[PDB]
Amino acid sequence: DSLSKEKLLTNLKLQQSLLKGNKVLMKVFQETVINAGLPPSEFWSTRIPLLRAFALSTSQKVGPYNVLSTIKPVNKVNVNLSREKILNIFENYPIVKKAYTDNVPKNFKEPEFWARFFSSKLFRKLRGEKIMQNDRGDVIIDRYLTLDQEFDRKDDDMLLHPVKKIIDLDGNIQDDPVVRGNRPDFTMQPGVDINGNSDGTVDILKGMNRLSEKMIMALKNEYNDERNELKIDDLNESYKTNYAIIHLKRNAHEKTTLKVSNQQMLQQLSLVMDNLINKLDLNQVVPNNEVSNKINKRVITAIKINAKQAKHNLEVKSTLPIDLLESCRMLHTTCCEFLKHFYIHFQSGEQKQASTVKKLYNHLKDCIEKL
């Protein structure tokens, strides 16, 4: 598909598409390719995710949904339509598209077609409305009513397939083919009128049923089982985690670029023991005025260094002019661009790309000369 490294690099249209709008990427591409000579294929090698992100934006489509139902006409009455809705109507209904392509534009304009379509009985039939003989409809669109009937039979065959015996209702009525009993009352049969023919309410029920079947089937596009379904999962053994445990041993070598005897500690401990019990003079803590100056002199030495560091700890204000600064930024950016591609193949570890390393080296040398 058009989401892999190979196809994305070779898709010229996509690369020009985002680059057309993407300004920051455009600035670097113009400098590092038009004049510097970096091959286009190498430039997009490190920007694969950028290409995929833009493609995915326009490479996805919404799911099927009932569109004619949403269309509510709401003396003058106005109904709002949008191109996205227009495409949805064609996708969810091929009869509308059939009468649209062969008519628009040959006889009249598109706006009249949709006004013609809505006023026609074809729109009512597709929307599920019960057709009323009183309604006049449109003469041109009504010509496709018979054609739509043929598609309905074709769609029924398209949806007709053998069904699993678990939920096969046909077999239940065919379990005994010689059942003879009282016919069900009229409440348990499709409605009929005085003349005896169908009232037509069954047709809309099939139409909505057909719409759902087509929508579900469209999902399964080109892009043992009963054993598990009937199993009682609640009675089976509870799921058990299979996480791996780890034990960390702590033993590392020491960092690499007179010992006091036991009695000495006791001897020294006694000295502090006596020096503490006998008396304690806090006033002796004051320096002698000869080391305080040295202590202060070295402490400030760090203060001055720290103060200089911290006084300069969005972009910082600069002294260079805008023209020179912009040129310097471009030179820094183009040199950095060459550095990345050079390291990818220089550190690739495959001798196949030796020529690229030599070629990438040349531009780096030119950067030194340019700098």
């Binding site: 010229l12 113009q30 038009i34």
Partner: peptide, 21 residues
């Protein structure tokens, strides 16, 4: 200007198509 940068890109991409083709 962006328009000038677009034209040279179109000419450059046109050259790419001409070169690749």
């Amino acid at each position: 200007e962006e328009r000038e940068n677009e034209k040279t890109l179109n000419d450059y991409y046109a050259a790419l198509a001409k070169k690749q083709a």
